[PDB]
Amino acid sequence: PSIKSGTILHAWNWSFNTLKNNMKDIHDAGYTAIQTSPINQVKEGNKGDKSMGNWYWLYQPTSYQIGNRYLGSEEEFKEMCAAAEEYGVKVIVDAVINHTTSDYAAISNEIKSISNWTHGNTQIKNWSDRWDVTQNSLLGLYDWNTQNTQVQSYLKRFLERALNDGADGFRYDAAKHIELPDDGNYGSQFWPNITNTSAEFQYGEILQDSASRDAAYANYMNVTASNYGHSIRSALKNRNLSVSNISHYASDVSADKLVTWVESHDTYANDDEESTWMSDDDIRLGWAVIASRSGSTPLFFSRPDGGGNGVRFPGKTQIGDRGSALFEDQAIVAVNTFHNVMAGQPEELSNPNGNNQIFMNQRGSKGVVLANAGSSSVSINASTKLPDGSYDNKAGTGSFQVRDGKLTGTINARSVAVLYPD
Numbered sequence: 001p002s003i004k005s006g007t008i009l010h011a012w013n014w015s016f017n018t019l020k021n022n023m024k025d026i027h028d029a030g031y032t033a034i035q036t037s038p039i040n041q042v043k044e045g046n047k048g049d050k051s052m053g054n055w056y057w058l059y060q061p062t063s064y065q066i067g068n069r070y071l072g073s074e075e076e077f078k079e080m081c082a083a084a085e086e087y088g089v090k091v092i093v094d095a096v097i098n099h100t101t102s103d104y105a106a107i108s109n110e111i112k113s114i115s116n117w118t119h120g121n122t123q124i125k126n127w128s129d130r131w132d133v134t135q136n137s138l139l140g141l142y143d144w145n146t147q148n149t150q151v152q153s154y155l156k157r158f159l160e161r162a163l164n165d166g167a168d169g170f171r172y173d174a175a176k177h178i179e180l181p182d183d184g185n186y187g188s189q190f191w192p193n194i195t196n197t198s199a200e201f202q203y204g205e206i207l208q209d210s211a212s213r214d215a216a217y218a219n220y221m222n223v224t225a226s227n228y229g230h231s232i233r234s235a236l237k238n239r240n241l242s243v244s245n246i247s248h249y250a251s252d253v254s255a256d257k258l259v260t261w262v263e264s265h266d267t268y269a270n271d272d273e274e275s276t277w278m279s280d281d282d283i284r285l286g287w288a289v290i291a292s293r294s295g296s297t298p299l300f301f302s303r304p305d306g307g308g309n310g311v312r313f314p315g316k317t318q319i320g321d322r323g324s325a326l327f328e329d330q331a332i333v334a335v336n337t338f339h340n341v342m343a344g345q346p347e348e349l350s351n352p353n354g355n356n357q358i359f360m361n362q363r364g365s366k367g368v369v370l371a372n373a374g375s376s377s378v379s380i381n382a383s384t385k386l387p388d389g390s391y392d393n394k395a396g397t398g399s400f401q402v403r404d405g406k407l408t409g410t411i412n413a414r415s416v417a418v419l420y421p422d
């Protein structure tokens with residue numbers, strides 16, 4: 001359909017070649033698009049070691065030439081895009097345009113030659129201060145002088161360059177740190193200008209807070225429902241999927257301009273290990289919830305192979321390799337497919353039998369998704385607009401029935417179910 005209407009696979013740290021080789025499986029998994037990690041030239045710290053723990057170097061730009069030791073060359077990037085188009089899957093590039101590396105010496109002359117190119121590296125002091133948040137340095141990373149139209153064309157040239165290479169959209173890293181046109185005496189035309197390209201879909205990483213200004217950003221790009229991420233995760237921890245907690249996106253921005261997730265590479269990879277505790281079953285349930293929804297765009301996070309249950313980096317693989325096979329898990333795919341065929345259809349959330357451990361989403365009268373966070377099997381019996389018949393769970397074993405407007409059958413413990421007519 002369209003990137004916005006489908007699901008995105010976050011091929012976190014997958015190399016271009018790795019991505020190119022899994023394009024058919026990616027497509028058969030049900031994703032409309034994939035999101036790469038930064039594709040520009042970065043500081044390859046720790047002598048370029050590929051240990052997963054070094055994942056953060058991909059966020060310290062040194063030059064805006066395409067290519068780096070972690071994901072491959074620009075040539076391989078173009079091949080990857082091409083391979084994706086053969087199966088109709090779109091490519092979204094993680095763009096780190098708010099800052100560069102903190103290592104001044106590592107920064108290429110290419111950018112240093114741009115006079116008045118940076119706001120400096122004076123680390124933010126007040127996270128409630130929009131001026132400080134957007135005009136100063138994040139963690140010491142030199143801040144681009146985005147008001148300077150010369151840096152604008154330089155960065156926009158990179159974006160257009162990637163578009164030409166096959167990229168179909170962008171994910172703006174630390175978008176919240178680039179000022180908006182209406183940010184008073186320190187605002188600029190950075191966003192109206194750089195978002196003005198042939199890109200099909202673009203959203204910014206906007207970690208919600210008192211100074212995030214979500215809705216303002218929503219006028220130029222889609223935005224991340226980070227708070228909703230906390231609700232989902234929290235619901236998964238307590239194994240309580242009460243529709244009284246997980247049906248509100250916790251944002252002033254409406255779902256049609258929202259990019260959702262169960263977790264983000266940041267909540268997983270950082271030393272805080274905020275979402276690292278979850279298991280694959282937690283993910284399936286979490287995915288069944290957010291990806292059954294309408295309007296919003298789910299972003300599936302491909303964890304390092306073997307990672308999970310508190311463990312960020314097991315050591316099985318390294319930067320460049322593919323993540324766990326969870327991205328093509330029967331349960332996950334079934335939901336991906338659901339999401340796609342249900343586009344347009346409205347949604348109706350609820351908890352069957354008043355049991356808060358059972359989640360049920362009803363898309364129009366075409367489909368139904370069930371999630372049971374509980375550890376005990378449950379006999380569902382509830383209202384549905386599905387025509388009468390015998391539906392087999394596409395997410396796994398089992399079957400369900402609909403007799404005179406009532407959905408009945410069994411939803412096993414810690415399981416997901418996807419129902420709809422062939």
Ligand SMILES: [Ca+2]
Nearest residue numbers: 134135177178
């Ligand atoms: Ca900034």
Ligand SMILES: [Ca+2]
Nearest residue numbers: 085166167168
């Ligand atoms: Ca393309």
Ligand SMILES: [Ca+2]
Nearest residue numbers: 273310311312
């Ligand atoms: Ca750990």
